[PDB]
Amino acid sequence: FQVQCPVCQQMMPAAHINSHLDRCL
Amino acid sequence: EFQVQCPVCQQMMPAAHINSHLDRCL
Ligand code: NA
Ligand code: NA
Ligand SMILES: [Zn+2]
Ligand SMILES: [Zn+2]
């Protein structure tokens, strides 16, 4: 399922969002 | 044809699509 990152706006699998926010911020 | 595992979500998918599947920081 895809979610939008609340910061950079990229669409990505929900299972990545936490990890993404942790790495990019 | 080749499956590789996603290092973030541990799902299997074709190697051709793993690049698209992961997102980078902008
Ligand atoms: Na994406
Ligand atoms: Na961080
Ligand atoms: Zn982001
Ligand atoms: Zn994944």
Curated annotation (Swiss-Prot), chain B:
Protein family per UniProt: Belongs to the AAA ATPase family. RarA/MGS1/WRNIP1 subfamily.
After translation, how is this protein modified? Sumoylated with SUMO1 and SUMO2/3.
Q: What is the effect of changing residue 4 to A?
A: Reduced affinity for ubiquitin
Q: How does it assemble?
A: Forms homooligomers, possibly octamers. Directly interacts with POLD1, POLD2 and POLD4. Interacts with the N-terminal domain of WRN. Interacts (via UBZ4-type zinc finger) with monoubiquitin and polyubiquitin. Interacts with TRIM14 and PPP6C; these interactions positively regulate the RIGI signaling pathway.
The segments annotated as UBZ4-type zinc fingers are 3-26
Q: What protein name does the entry list?
A: ATPase WRNIP1
The entry's Zn(2+)-binding residues are 6, 9, 17, 21, 25
Localization per record: Nucleus; Cytoplasm
Species of origin reads Homo sapiens
Specify the effect of residue 8 to A: Reduced affinity for ubiquitin
Tissue specificity, in the record's words, reads: Ubiquitously expressed.
Source organism superkingdom: Eukaryota
From the record, what ranges are coiled-coil? none
Q: What is the effect of changing residue 22 to A?
A: Loss of affinity for ubiquitin
